[PDB]
Structures are given as structure tokens and as C-alpha cells.
Design an enzyme around this catalytic site. Structure first.
Site, PDB file in Angstrom:
ATOM      1  N   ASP A   1       0.846  -1.183   0.132  1.00 21.25           N
ATOM      2  CA  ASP A   1      -0.029   0.035  -0.033  1.00 21.25           C
ATOM      3  C   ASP A   1       0.872   1.271  -0.056  1.00 21.25           C
ATOM      4  O   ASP A   1       1.611   1.192   1.074  1.00 21.25           O
ATOM      5  CB  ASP A   1      -0.890   0.044   1.394  1.00 21.25           C
ATOM      6  CG  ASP A   1      -1.898   0.879   1.253  1.00 21.25           C
ATOM      7  OD1 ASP A   1      -1.932   1.869   0.454  1.00 21.25           O
ATOM      8  OD2 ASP A   1      -2.760   0.897   2.039  1.00 21.25           O
TER       9      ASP A   1
ATOM     10  N   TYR B   1     -14.663  10.466   0.670  1.00 16.06           N
ATOM     11  CA  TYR B   1     -14.723   8.973   0.472  1.00 16.06           C
ATOM     12  C   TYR B   1     -13.966   8.322   1.859  1.00 16.06           C
ATOM     13  O   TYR B   1     -14.348   7.271   1.843  1.00 16.06           O
ATOM     14  CB  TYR B   1     -13.965   8.678  -0.923  1.00 16.06           C
ATOM     15  CG  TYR B   1     -12.672   8.491  -0.983  1.00 16.06           C
ATOM     16  CD1 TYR B   1     -11.939   9.507  -1.262  1.00 16.06           C
ATOM     17  CD2 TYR B   1     -12.060   7.386  -1.053  1.00 16.06           C
ATOM     18  CE1 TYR B   1     -10.376   9.331  -1.404  1.00 16.06           C
ATOM     19  CE2 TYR B   1     -10.697   6.927  -0.976  1.00 16.06           C
ATOM     20  CZ  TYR B   1      -9.871   8.215  -1.398  1.00 16.06           C
ATOM     21  OH  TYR B   1      -8.603   8.128  -1.442  1.00 16.06           O
TER      22      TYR B   1
END
Lengths: 719, 722
Positions: free
Chosen positions: A387, A551
Site C-alpha cells: 500500500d 470518500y
């Protein structure tokens, strides 16, 4: 005037830099011409030819030879006179960097051998005709990835005669998923096709009950991309000896994606403004970004998690590492290895929005890279989660990974890299805590099924969704799932609050709610249901809190609040409907049109607390893409991009973006403004260069509305 | 047009220097009544005087700091003076500890201390121990997992309408450190003598030289000196270290060691090994960490320059100052920049000579790193204890970075799969020297394998004395032992690598033994090197031996070969021959680098069996020490005259001679400059010192000039009470 006391040779950390190998390494005339001389070299590097086609490197828009490690390829050298096995001695040399060393793997002398042994470098004379020798050169499957210089050296008794510098013979050597001895070997052809050769992707976003999808151009074969990938490693000053290690390449490469100061590819930003740069939502693929980075030599503004993943996926696939993007729904980012997310409540049952500062992302994207893990025990090879979106790990605010998805599913978080932080993204519990007016805290409820509810990735061949949730977690309630958690707690994962008296609600009252999917600008209903399974009568006070969020889950404003006084009869069921009007949210919406709902209830009788959360995204209508023309490589094709303003308001500085690897270079059109409900058209002539199934990609971004996309599958033909 | 922060609801809380404003009154809801009816704080007493019981029982009385300093997981006393007596029946209040600009209770940066009847182990809480007038005395206990740093203290009175809180008071700011005395603390050390040495001792010994001539010098850790504790917190703020992780010894070590070696403009020390050090201070001149850390604090930029022992000295101060037990270790013959390879290559010419163009890697005469004591809850049971941390960068899986913390236990057993950077530390002490002939045709032939040269001795200062403690057995098992072979195999399974294959070196046709000695010499003097052959088998041989003597840096990097010799030896069966070589001063003088290091290669080719014998040794030339003398009373507060004396050992002029004096608790580090010193002449430096710390102390001196340097001196003095 200064000595180099730290090391005898400066670090060899730039593929771009090169020294100058001597053409004559004599040891005295003591006391030539009659020795072999190279007149020319042939690499059979045409894209239609056997080398590129057998190596699966024919897609690269590169005219130089590109091969994959651990697999043989053909070359032919022409000499001034026929080569004689008795009396003649020569060898091919591969050199990389300014300070090549044979023991560092940067100076590679290829010896002529009778038989090619698996795993070692060697050249086999497969044919001798006249003044020519045809060689089958095999590279080591642990070879360094990058662009090598090639030389031919003839060994005389008084030294070496070597070919001079020739940029035309520079050879790129990449990772080889086809080679069984390669660390990145993937034994399934369909998977190699998808995870390595496919230059177009699908990114899943939205929310778990309304999965949205958009296309992304990886464009790894496009002109300049391979070179930019080498430039990224050079900017990272990545040691050449380490570039043949997929783990280190993943580790260093991912740290370069998110820019800290002036180093890095992309500047991260979630401010809904993005002054002096491009909004994360505007990007249509990696090509645009990587080329901008290359030419400007500075970080590109701006990116967010899926953009980081798209670009990192391009990097991996371009070098030969099997890679895919995954989307986790309801993601616990910035977890600090805690397996708990806190929601604070007021004493009455309302959500205490002053204390409740942590948020669950509706979705978060990261990458998976396929490789063996020789640094870990057996069984941890395969997909490794990486990530490039930073968070606090043991080293600081950095990317996490590679972490073995196998270790994560089993809770073996003691194995590098940054495993506890990835495990917590998909396994956290939502803890509902009442923060009393006197100062104490009371744990009311625990939701162990919200975070990491669905993990998805693009399917093999096809734009469909593939549910890979069980690759990360065991199914809830399973014995293996509880063992995985216990093992994680042993190795550094933590649960600060003990939760025992909790979850044993003696109410037997079930509460849940649903929100209908709505279109931007429309009204929509929200139904809350209450099931009473007991033979007791209850009275309940419920609260509805609705917010406009990013988001990432971060709330901007509560746009609606409601209280319900419910009375539940024994063995009864009942639904209440609330009506949300377009006027309540419009004008306050952030990019991605995300809304978050909290429904908390307090049972007056038993003092129990019920809580539920849900997210919703308003559907924005797509962009229309039309194709008029013939549809054949080399020949024109007219593409028309059409956008209809959906708001009853004027859109200003509307940028539209067009993209499609092998059909068009990324382009963009700027529209002064667009009148309420009116349509604009963009016509561009395209001359494709790649045949087969291709795709056109579009995006729209304005000063207000953005995160609007469009796509079209087209079929181009050959000649 | 907006502004919005969508990445996170609250900015990261990563500075201890930054602070928020807590309201002195904070009411919510309708009222109407007298607020004067509730308690009011007139004053707060921390009992933070240095002779008092809080600092003494917390072992924090040595810090030259006037604020309260306590250690986590252990109770301390405070007293609150109210406006009227505390009525248990109707009053409600709590103490609050706050750190950073964005405090949060669930992140451990806002800590409301509740009044409890009984203090539970492991949790925050305050117990009322005395009621008297308008005052209440509390016994406050902090959590053993508490964030380490300087907290702001507030007293908050709860009313049914909200909170009444004291105002900002810098006088009550409290430092909470790691606690090696608390059993529940991750850094718990179970013995007082170890705590005394590894935490409380502010003076250390750094071993250098070479394995057969171990040199020592003293270093000032000075963790208790004025300004140091604050500079340590400043280091973490410069690193932007999240306040929530400063209570984790692993993360503090990880982030802190990364800040030692400056990359660009970030970090404490700029590394340099150029023998020049223009525009800075030579790594050899430093006498301790104080000088460096304060300069870094005031200039706010990296300090020039440092080398491995300097990084370790400074990092050791950092750890001890915060409360993490730490020590410096020296590894003799260290394989740094190993890239996890368990092999170091020496390339030979076809005749037997050393190929100096191909031989590019070097073994360091010595290399220093640190060990920090702590549990390792991120690893399986049994990996706690000393953890190696090397702030001297080398390529690891992440790039050119420091390595560690790596469990010394895991390193000893070859379990290098456990973070952090374990393979790289394992290779510093376990590599094999591989002698390879690079033939004229291009091929390579492995001749010999020496598995006993690298990591020959690993030492550290002894507990309660300046002698050395051999800890080699903590990093590796005995050569030729069963456990050692298994350790090596386990390492190979997890990333360690051996590029060349050495099964064929069964060419152990060592019927003939060879070895050599170099006598210890003083700079300027001639010395001898004695090569010794040995024919342990019935046979006669014709041998050709080669001697290559080089001037090197301590890192092993050669500058020049100053002597070369060939020998044609013929020894009879079962007989042993000896060859002595005389190296005259004139051969090396004038070419020496700082540290006066010399390296010797002795390679031999047996004409008959075609075998190759090779050995290598290092030598450091001894330099006379600086003489420190004192004359006075020797009691705190009163004067003491110290005289530093240096005698030029070179028969040439030393120019720009800087002399340095140091001694924690006796003097602030100082330096005197001398225009030039004539051949064989002596200079004297005199200083009046007014010590502030009693008991066993030490004076430390160092000398550095345009040419000669790496010269030290010391003196144990005894200061008295009065």
C-alpha cells in the site's frame, strides 16, 4: 586533496550513468590484425521476430532489444574472418552503471559453453557459417533488471580487444513470470496475460452496496514508460545490485510513489480544491503522470489512493512483476495496528461528534505483487499486499508492504513488512462507547462485521468483479478466524479496550436500515426496521444522523438529523420511512458524492444501545463516447466525446480528458463553461497503433462537479 | 473555493513543542447559580526539588533540570491547595496530562487522571493520601505504556454544568520517561547494577584499534547535562514522530537511529571519511555527545562531521537520556556493506600476488554500533533482550539506511526472518573471506576460504569499570560447534546468501601452515613483521611468498602500498621456517592517514601442490597520550585547576592544533586553538573548573591538527561533597 575513506568504489546506483570500457586492454606489444575482429552484431530485435515474440516483449513501443531473464535468446556476431574453435577466444559482455563489478552482478562476462546449464549465464554456438557465429545466450534468472550495454571481447595473449560503445545494441532485461526459476514465476498462462500483459485496468470504488467501476490506462508498453520506470529507481538512487530482487524493487518503488517534499512521483491531496495542479479525479491512467514526472523531474499534483495504485501497478507490470489493484470496502486506514475503531455516543444515544474523530474509508485501494518470499518461512510466497498510501507504521509515515497475504489471513503479523497495519485495515471492530457527562466511558456495542466487508479486484479477461475477500480473512464465526485473531494479538496487533459484558444484548431487538440508491439531484428514502423477538413490550428512542463526507469517511457537515419514538409490541416487526430531499444535500456535496448515515437507538427498558452505519454515493451519469470511421491500425477513426451537464447550475472551467492505450496519447479539452442542462461535444481524430480489443477512456473535472467518467470498447484491425 | 481537509479529521499530533489552549471554564447547557460555590485551585505543589523523594525514587535527580521528571508506571506525589477544604461528599475533580497540539484520549495524548480508592497496577489513577486545611495530597500512578515526553498538567473541577480548569502553567510541566525499574515496562532491567551502568552512567568507553592491540578512549554521554533531555525531544519533533508512538521503545529506536546520520539537511550528524573535513570538526576531535547535540539544537542543522563511533556515542546519549538501557559494542574485522552476502572476496594474480585492482571490498578494522534493551512483543517469545541497532547506513531491503533493532538472540540463532534488517547485521559478524585467482583468460578459481577472520571479537565496556567485556558469544556460537552450523543453515533459508560454492575448497591440502606476526609499534619507530611457515607433513617444498603492506583508513580502504616483498622459501619435511622483515619508519611516515592504520597481506604459492596460503592482519601505530593534571581542593562548588599537556611526537611542525577538554558534571566541553607546535615541543592548557557533580568523575581530552589527530587523554578524579 581528499581521500575516499568510506568505500573503495562509489555506489553503483544509476542505470543512466556509464563508464567507458577500453577497446584495447593490452599487456605490452611484447613484441593483432590476425586476431578476430567484430564487423557487426545482429540481435534479431524486430517486433515480429522470434526473440521479442518468445520473450513476450513485442508490445513495448521500443526499438531496442528487450528480453526476460532466465530464458535464452539469439544473437549473431560477424567477424573479419571465420571463427576458429582452436586458436580463437571471445566472449560477450553485459555492463550496467558507472562502476561495474563482476561480483556485484553489474559486470557480466558471458562464456561460450558447449551446453547451457539452467540458472547460469552462458552462450552456445548454435551455428557457424562463413564469418558468422549464431549464439543462443541464456541469462541468469536472478539477473539485475535494467538496461545493459553490450560488448564483444576477443582475448589475445597480450590483452583484450573489445567492441566500442554502441547504443544500438543496448539490451533491456526484465522479470520473467514465464521462467520457473524466476522469483516472479506465475504458472498459469491466463493469469500472466492479465497480471502482466494487460495494459488496461478496472478500479472499483463507490461503496459496498453500490459498487462503481471505471477504467484506467496502465499503458506499460507505451513509448517512454519503460525508461521512466528505470528513471524512478535512479531517482530513488536504488542500488543496481538490488534491482533484480522483486521484494526490494517493491519496497523502494512504493516509497517513491507518494512524494514527501520534492522527492517522489505524486503529491497527495484530499482538499477538494487542488490549486496549482490536477484533481485526483481527473486522471485517466498512468502514462500522463509518469511522462510529466519524467520531463518536469518534479512531483506531479495531485493524487489519492487509486491514483497511487494505478501508477504503482504500471511500474510493476512494466518491469515484469505480476500485479493487480485491490479495493477494500470499509477500510480502517491510519490504524496504528489497533483492531478497534471508536464511535463515541452522548448519554441519550446520539453520536457524540466532538469525540468521534476516526473514520472508516468507504473504500481504499492498494496493490498486490506476485513473488516468492525467500526471506520468510515456506508458504508465504504469492500475492503480497503493498500500500503506497502512507500511514504510521513502525518506521514512520510510510507505505506498508510487501506483506504476505497468506501471513495476513493467518495472523502471522510478525513477518515483514508492515503486516500488522495491513491486517488492521481489514479486521478492525467498531466499538460504540458512551462518553458520560461525569467523565467515564462505557462500552455499549461491538460490530465485528463492518470493516473489510468486501475485497475485490478485476477478473481475469473481462471487466467484471472478482471477490477475493476470503484470500484476506477466514469467514466470520469460523474456528480458523478466531485463531488468526489470537495469533495476531500475540505479534503486536492490539485491542486497547476489553469487550466482555458487551454484545450480549438481552433485548433480542434487531435493528437495521437501508437507503435506496439515488441519482444526483433526486430524492430518496431511508427505511429503518425494528424486529422484536421477545415477549416483552419496549419503547425506543432512535436518532438519525446524516452527513456529507469525503470518500475517506471524514465528515464535512451533518445535513439531516431526526429522532424517532418507537414502541415495539412483543413478537412484532415494524418499518419507518424517512424522506431525504435533493434540496437537503445539493449545494453541499463533495467530490464523489458520498453520504454517511448513523442510526443509533436506546431501549428505555433494558438500557441497551443499537447502532448501525451505512454509506451511500449518488449516481452521476456517465460521459458518452462515439466512434465514427473504419477502425484499423494506421487509418483514421473519429472519436466524439459528449458531456451533458446534469446540474441545474453552470459548470465552469470544465476539463475533459481522453485516453486509450495504443489508440491515443492522453489528451484534454478545456471548456469555458457549460450552461445548465446543456451538452458539449469534443471531436478528435485518432490513428490507432495497436490492433485487437482496445478501449477509449474519458473523465470530466470542473471547479465544482467532478469524478465523472466514461468508456467505450472498440475493435481495431491489422493491415 | 472551499478549503477542506479530507485526509483526516484531525492533523497528525507529532510535535511535543506544539500545544493547544484548554479553556479555563467550559460549560454546556442551561444554568442559571454561584460558580464560586465550587472548588478552586490556589496552587499546585509537585515536590520536584532534587533532594526530594519524587526525583530520588524515580532516579531522575541527576538531570540538570528544574521541572518535575518522573518515570512511567511508578507513583509520585503532588499537592493541590484549594480555596476551601475538599469535601468528599460533594466535590469532584481530576488531574489532566496533555501533550501536543491535537490531544485525544484514545490516542493517549489527553489523560484524565481519576481519583480512585486503590491504585490498580497498569492503569492511570490518583489516590488521596492526605487532607489538611484547603489542601489534598495525591499519589499519582501513570500507566507503564505511557508516551514519553514533556506533558502539561491541569487540575479540572467538575460541576453539573461543566468544567472549571486551572490555566496554563509552565512551572508544572512534567517529563515522563521510560522506567527500567518497573517490571511492567517494556524496558525493564531486573538488576540494579545493570540499571546503574546502562541507564545512569553518563561516561563510557569506546574500544577501537585492532583485535591484537585493543585501544580505548572515554566518551561523555552527558545525558544529565543541561539542555540534553530537551534536545532529545527536539530530535523526535524534527523527525515528525507521532506522539502516540513515543511510548514504544521499538519505534523510538527505529525512528531515532534513522535521524543520526543526516541525509541532506535532515539529521544530527553529517558523515565523512575524507581525512580532510574542511568546514567542520574532524570525527576524531569530539570528546562526547553534549557538544554535538547542543550545536544541533541551536544551529538547527546537521553537525559536521561524524563516523561510526560518533553516531553510536550520540545515539547512546539519546537512548540513555530517555530511559532505554543502552550500550556501545565494537566488532573487530567487520563486514559492513555486505548486502546480506556471507562472503568477502580477495582477488589474486596468477603468480599468487594480490590483485589490487579487482579487490574492492574491505573489512573494517572495527565498527561500532549500539544495543538497546527491550521486550519484542512483535516477535515470538524469546527474542527480547539486547537489540542491535546500527545507525551507520548500509544497503538493506529499504535502501541506504541504519539497520535495526535486530534481536541479538535471533542473530545468534540465524533466525534472520525477523525484523528489522537482521540479515545485514548477521553478515557483519559471520562472513567468510574467499581468496580467488582471477586467471588471465577470464575465469575465476576459488583457492582458499577463511571462516575465522570476520567478527573475531565483539566487546563492550564492563559493568562498573573501564575494562572490556567480551560478548562475542552473544552474537555467535563457537567455530566448529554444532549450533553454529545450524545457525548458518537457518540464515541461508531466510535470505542470507553465499554466491560462490565452497564445497570444492576441500582443497584443504593444508599440510603446510603459515601465519605471521607484526610487533606493536609506536608512530615514528621501525618495527618487525615475522612470517612463519610449518611443514606438518613428510615432504619438501619450494614456496614463493608475497608481502603487501598498505596504508589504510580504519574502514579497510587502502590509500597506497608502501612496501612489497617476495620470498623464495624451501623448507624440509616436518621442519618449520621463519622469516623476519624490518619495516623502517621512513617507509610509512609522511603517508599515514588518521588512526595510523596499516594492513598486511601475506600470500603464498606452494610450487609442488599448486596450493595457495593467505593471511591478513592489521596494525595501528601507538601514539603517546595527552596528560591531564589537577591541583586544588576537589569538592563541588569550589575551584579546581586542570592542566592539559601535549607533547608533539612528530619531528615536524603541527599546525592549527585544537585541544578539547570535557568531563560531565565538571566542565562544559571546551576547546583551545594553538597556532602551531614546534617539533618535539610541549604546550600547556590551564583551566579553572568549578564542578557540580560529586563522586567518581572523569576529565577527557582530545587533540586534532592539520595533519596529526586521533590523540586522546583522560584522568579519573574524585569530587567531594560540601
Amino acid at each position: 586533496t581528499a581521500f575516499g575513506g568510506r568505500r573503495a568504489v562509489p555506489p553503483n546506483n544509476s542505470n543512466a550513468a556509464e563508464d567507458d570500457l577500453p577497446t584495447v586492454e593490452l599487456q605490452g606489444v611484447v613484441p593483432l590484425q590476425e586476431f578476430l575482429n567484430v564487423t557487426s552484431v545482429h540481435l534479431f530485435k524486430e517486433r515480429w521476430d522470434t526473440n521479442k515474440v518468445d520473450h513476450h516483449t513485442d508490445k513495448y513501443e521500443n526499438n531496442k532489444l528487450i528480453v526476460r531473464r532466465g530464458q535464452s535468446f539469439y544473437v549473431q556476431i560477424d567477424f573479419s574472418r571465420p571463427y576458429d574453435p582452436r586458436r580463437d577466444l571471445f566472449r560477450v559482455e553485459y555492463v550496467i552503471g558507472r562502476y561495474p563489478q563482476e561480483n556485484k552482478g553489474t559486470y557480466i562476462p558471458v562464456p561460450i559453453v558447449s551446453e547451457l546449464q539452467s540458472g547460469k549465464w552462458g552462450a552456445k554456438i548454435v551455428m557457424r557459417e562463413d564469418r558468422s557465429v549464431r549464439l543462443s545466450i541464456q541469462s541468469s534468472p536472478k539477473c539485475i533488471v535494467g538496461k545493459f550495454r553490450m560488448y564483444v571481447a576477443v582475448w589475445t595473449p597480450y590483452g583484450v580487444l573489445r567492441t566500442s560503445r554502441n547504443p544500438e545494441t543496448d539490451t533491456y532485461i526484465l522479470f520473467n513470470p514465464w521462467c520457473e526459476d524466476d522469483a516472479v514465476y506465475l504458472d498459469n498462462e491466463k493469469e500472466r496475460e492479465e497480471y502482466v500483459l494487460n495494459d488496461i485496468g478496472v478500479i472499483f470504488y463507490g461503496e459496498v452496496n453500490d459498487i462503481k467501476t471505471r477504467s484506467w490506462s496502465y499503458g506499460q508498453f507505451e513509448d517512454g514508460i519503460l525508461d521512466t520506470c528505470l528513471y524512478v529507481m535512479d531517482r530513488a538512487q536504488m542500488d543496481l545490485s538490488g534491482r533484480g530482487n522483486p521484494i526490494k524493487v517493491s519496497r523502494v518503488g512504493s516509497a517513491m510513489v507518494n512524494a514527501k517534499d520534492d522527492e517522489g512521483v505524486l503529491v497527495g491531496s484530499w482538499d477538494n480544491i487542488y490549486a496549482y495542479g490536477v484533481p485526483p479525479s481527473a486522471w485517466t491512467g498512468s502514462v500522463d503522470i509518469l511522462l510529466e514526472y519524467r520531463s518536469s523531474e518534479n512531483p506531479v499534483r495531485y493524487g489519492q489512493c487509486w491514483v497511487f495504485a494505478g501508477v504503482f501497478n504500471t511500474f510493476l507490470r512494466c518491469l515484469g512483476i505480476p500485479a493487480r489493484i485491490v479495493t477494500n470496502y470499509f477500510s480502517a486506514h491510519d490504524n496504528d495496528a489497533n483492531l478497534q475503531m471508536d464511535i463515541f455516543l452522548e448519554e441519550d444515544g446520539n453520536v457524540n461528534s466532538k469525540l468521534t474523530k476516526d473514520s472508516v474509508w468507504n473504500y481504499h485501494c492498494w496493490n498486490e505483487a506476485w513473488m516468492t518470499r525467500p526471506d520468510l518461512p515456506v508458504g508465504f510466497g504469492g500475492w503480497q499486499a503493498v500500500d503506497s498510501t502512507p500511514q504510521e507504521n513502525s518506521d514512520g509515515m510510510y507505505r506498508c508492504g510487501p506483506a504476505s497475504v497468506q501471513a495476513i489471513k493467518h495472523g502471522h503479523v510478525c513477518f515483514q513488512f508492515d503486516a500488522p497495519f495491513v491486517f488492521a485495515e481489514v479486521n478492525s471492530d467498531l466499538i460504540y462507547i458512551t462518553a458520560k457527562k461525569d467523565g467515564t466511558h462505557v462500552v455499549e456495542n461491538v460490530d465485528a462485521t463492518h470493516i473489510g466487508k468486501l475485497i475485490v479486484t478485476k477478473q481475469i479477461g473481462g471487466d467484471g468483479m472478482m471477490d477475493i475477500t476470503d484470500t484476506y480473512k477466514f469467514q466470520e464465526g469460523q474456528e480458523e478466524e478466531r485463531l488468526a485473531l489470537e495469533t495476531a494479538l500475540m505479534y503486536g496487533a492490539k485491542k486497547p479496550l476489553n469487550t466482555e459484558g458487551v454484545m450480549k444484548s438481552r433485548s433480542n431487538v434487531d435493528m437495521d436500515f437501508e437507503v435506496e440508491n439515488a441519482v444526483l439531484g433526486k430524492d430518496f428514502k431511508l427505511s429503518i426496521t425494528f424486529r422484536n423477538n421477545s415477549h416483552n413490550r419496549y419503547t425506543i428512542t432512535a436518532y438519525l444522523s446524516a452527513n456529507i463526507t469525503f470518500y475517506t469517511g471524514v465528515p464535512k457537515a451533518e445535513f439531516k438529523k431526526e429522532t424517532f419514538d418507537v414502541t415495539l409490541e412483543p413478537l412484532s416487526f415494524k418499518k419507518e420511512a424517512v424522506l431525504i430531499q435533493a434540496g437537503e444535500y445539493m449545494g453541499q456535496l463533495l467530490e464523489q458524492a458520498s453520504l454517511h448515515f448513523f442510526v443509533t437507538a436506546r431501549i428505555n427498558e433494558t438500557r441497551d444501545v443499537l447502532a448501525k452505519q451505512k454509506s451511500t454515493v449518488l449516481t452521476i451519469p456517465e460521459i458518452i463516447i462515439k466512434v465514427r470511421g473504419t477502425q484499423v491500425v494506421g487509418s483514421d477513426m473519429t472519436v466524439t466525446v459528449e458531456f451533458t451537464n446534469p446540474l441545474k447550475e453552470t459548470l465552469r472551467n470544465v476539463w475533459v480528458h481522453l485516453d486509450g492505450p495504443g489508440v491515443t496519447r492522453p489528451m484534454k479539452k478545456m471548456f469555458r463553461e457549460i450552461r445548465p442542462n446543456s451538452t458539449v461535444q469534443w471531436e478528435e481524430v485518432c490513428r490507432p497503433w495497436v490492433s485487437g480489443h482496445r478501449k477509449l477512456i474519458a473523465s470530466m473535472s470542473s471547479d465544482s462537479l467532478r469524478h465523472v467518467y466514461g468508456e467505450l470498447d472498440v475493435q481495431i484491425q491489422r493491415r
